[PDB]
Amino acid sequence: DRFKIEGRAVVPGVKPQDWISAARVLVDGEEHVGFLKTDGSFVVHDIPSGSYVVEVVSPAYRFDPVRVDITSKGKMRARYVNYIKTSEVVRLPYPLQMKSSGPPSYFIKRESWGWTDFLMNPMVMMMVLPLLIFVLLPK
């Protein structure tokens, strides 16, 4: 007994054909691999019964994995990915519609010190009094 899973992924903007390039979807991670269509859709066949996590892998805009439960009779139940808990959290319709949030942060941020902010230093403030006193002399 074999079944198929189809889904549709919509990017907020850009171009679907721009994002299709170098885009694949994983069901277990190395066992079953699906490829996307020209606009966007993952269609996977040759699957057994069981529970699998569908995740779209992309160096570009990332996606949230979605848990899918396959029954032998032919019922398909999709849920949120939960590891600590193993119950039903929220049930959503079957036609997978992933919405990528955006580019994940790959690099860290480093900030410099502001000009108005470096005036708070214990040493910089002890020079401002001599600076003002010496400025008020020629004036």
């Binding site: 108005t116 902010d117 708070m120 230093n121 214990p122 403030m125 002890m126 009094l129 006193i133």
Partner: protein, 282 residues
Amino acid sequence: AVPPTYADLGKSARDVFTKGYGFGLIKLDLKTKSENGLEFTSSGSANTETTKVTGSLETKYRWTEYGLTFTEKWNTDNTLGTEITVEDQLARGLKLTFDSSFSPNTGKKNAKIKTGYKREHINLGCDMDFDIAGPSIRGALVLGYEGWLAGYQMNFETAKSRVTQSNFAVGYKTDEFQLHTNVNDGTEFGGSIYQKVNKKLETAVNLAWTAGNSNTRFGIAAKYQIDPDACFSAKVNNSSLIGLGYTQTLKPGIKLTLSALLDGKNVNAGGHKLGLGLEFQA
């Protein structure tokens, strides 16, 4: 001349309410004056309810050569604080205050600039607070002619929005009658009266009113010195709060103060808050 500032306005009544009793806390202060200019203060506060030990070493350097004052303080949570005060440098009544705080263990810095203009009957003050959260600017201006005095305080912050905090304090201050009414944004309404019948009798009354929930609370305090070394203080609040304090000079510098706050009812529910205070001056 030299009209009272906003913080000092009414400070007599609060000080009567504040000084005298420290129940729940242990007071231990030592003050030392040197010959030339050195001032050393070591104070230690001990709590029995929360079992906490608090204290600060304060070193004061009074330099009358140029009007400079150097203050350095140290707390118990690894907080370091320095202060420079300059008065009568080039203007008539101009005072510049610089306060800095730095921590050596962790890394934290805070800055504060105070400016004060004092004249015949005009008082100006501006405090600029520099912190990572957001700089703030606070200005207080006090004006009076003979006994009629009124002050205005404003607080502004650039970090959030056009936030403005208004304060209008109108009072009548004379030799033995001191009345002051403080208004906060037309929301807080405080009124303090303080008077002295003789050189041994002092009475103070405080009232608090609000416009939000219409909460009213009043309290009266009496201070009477039996002898130049023996003094007694009593305070009664609106609902049931009573507090009694007694101070006596034991050695010519050594003084002992005892404070007791009683909150008792008649439904088998009562509580005592006691406190001892002791200071040395040299």
